[PDB]
């Protein structure tokens, strides 16, 4: 339901977006380094409004994912941590910048703490420090601060230091089952139900140990949606890495199920980010559709660029619909994105979309190419993007050109068909069509009208076209070989006829008559020529038979004018008039023998001229 | 495309035969068409060809004796063969004319023509 051309604003981002999509394909083909996310990051940062900031952060989410082997849970946590860390940098060692964030926003104007029961050592809430270090991804710093405070945390928490070192010195960020059972017992016996317990201490225990998965949120320290997302993401394990699945478990699907069950109602100005961070990529695309088709389409391209994946091919072919006619080349640019998913049906779906674009817009020269002045083909945009099509083939291009050609012929688009058959390199068919077009022009265009005007060209004028095809093809051994010898001959004969018609139109009677005799079609020679040419008539090519009537009319008319000219002196005027009258006579006898295969008016036109001689 | 060659069969030397080919499934009018023969052992060779407009051209082998024609209304091609010789015995195929016979790769079943004596 989107129409890109309906206003300056809605048309300016389209080309701005299409231009990114364009150099993406360029690096795609050039095997380059282009990164679409940071291009949309650049354009989206200047704009604003809430959805734009929403969209802007979503691309920064996609950008962070780049060059990372993609584990949904891991990249999601890395995003939320690096964002918080940079937040504490914007606000201002990392440890001292987090310390200052703590002293600032955890304290009321009294210098009182907003959270009660904080364990405070030298004015530093050490469990809040450990926690926010973890919240920033600074695991080794977080373990560090716990270590320095070993002499200030009694013995109940002393054991926790060993579980932390273990959690920190690993890659799985999991604990050996002997540790997770010990830590869970200690959590249940001392921490979980503590009366005056520090809430950050409880959060850190729960995060490091995955203690008590029945309660996933610590609301007292969950100060933002990002915190809620991070804390859940922190608790997810793979199914095959659950130490005690019948007691408790938490997987990514569990996390996605509750995000879905809550819906956007519970996710404020953050639902698109939440869907993206939870790995619900289709839902994030679908949600984006509710407010901007253009940004939805392009977010899908971003997600396809990352191999993350309504259906891509239909997403891309639907976006194209409002500008297929207006902008055929950029339509190709988006249809070619269909092979980002690299699927067995994706390649075929992209082919069928391209074929539909060509057959429907009939934009043959931009999409399929055109013939240069020398006869050499200039590639169209589909051909220029052939690498991106993953073609086994160039067979595809050939096949679509031939289909457009037969449709052209069926529709009566003669010029289209001649252009397409040239592109398909169907050279004998081209000369066949050109001969048919020139022959029909010569026989059907009223005789006294001119055939070529000062502003006619080789693309649309039948005489100028045939001349161009003869010049660029017949003297090209590679091409000329492929044109039947008689099709070449019919072409040159028709062209000689068109030269005769021009001389005639220009009142060059004598020279018209001389070129006429060189055709070797009419009986100029003697009495018996009429009989010979009459017999030949039934064997003439279809292209020629229909032009015999005008040739007879030109001949009789040229003789009639030349006899008047001779009678208005010279020694042998009589012999030249007798000779001319002889040609008229032979032509009239020939004409009378073939006249019932001629138009019914031809003979009558002819003999009315003959008796004036 | 489909090429249904009929006509022909066995005939005594010096006799006459008329081959025909009913076509379907392509636009007949725009194509130069040809009649070919394939003698046992020998390769398939071009015997006669005809442009869209009815202009014809013949191999020396059959000049004066064979006559190719076409009917663009009925989408048929025909080959009248007169004063036949046993050297003309072969299977005869009708197909689009092309400069090098090997490249066709899209034919019909053909009609066998055999001339005795």
Author numbering:
A (entry chain A): 199 to 290, 300 to 516, 532 to 615, 617 to 791, 795 to 839
B (entry chain B): 2 to 118
What does the paper say about this structure?
In addition to the Y complex nanobodies, we identified a nanobody, VHH-SAN12, that binds Nic96 of the inner ring complex. We solved the complex of Nic96186–839 with VHH-SAN12 by MR with the published scNic96186–839 structure as a template. Nic96186–839 forms an elongated structure of 30 α-helices. VHH-SAN12 inserts its CDR loops 1 and 2 into the space between helices α20–21 and α22–25. Interestingly, VHH-SAN12 has one the shortest CDR3 of the library and CDR3 contributes little to the binding interface, which is unusual for a nanobody. VHH-SAN12 binds Nic96 between its trunk and tail modules. The interaction between the CDR loops of VHH-SAN12 and these trunk-tail interface helices maintains Nic96 in a different conformation than previously observed by X-ray crystallography. VHH-SAN12 brings helices α20–21 and α22–25 slightly closer to each other, resulting in a ~19 Å shift between the two crown domains. At the increased resolution (from 2.5 to 2.1 Å), we were able to complete Nic96 by including helix α9, and two loops including 30 additional residues. We speculate that the improvement of the data is due to the ability of the nanobody to stabilize Nic96 in one conformation.
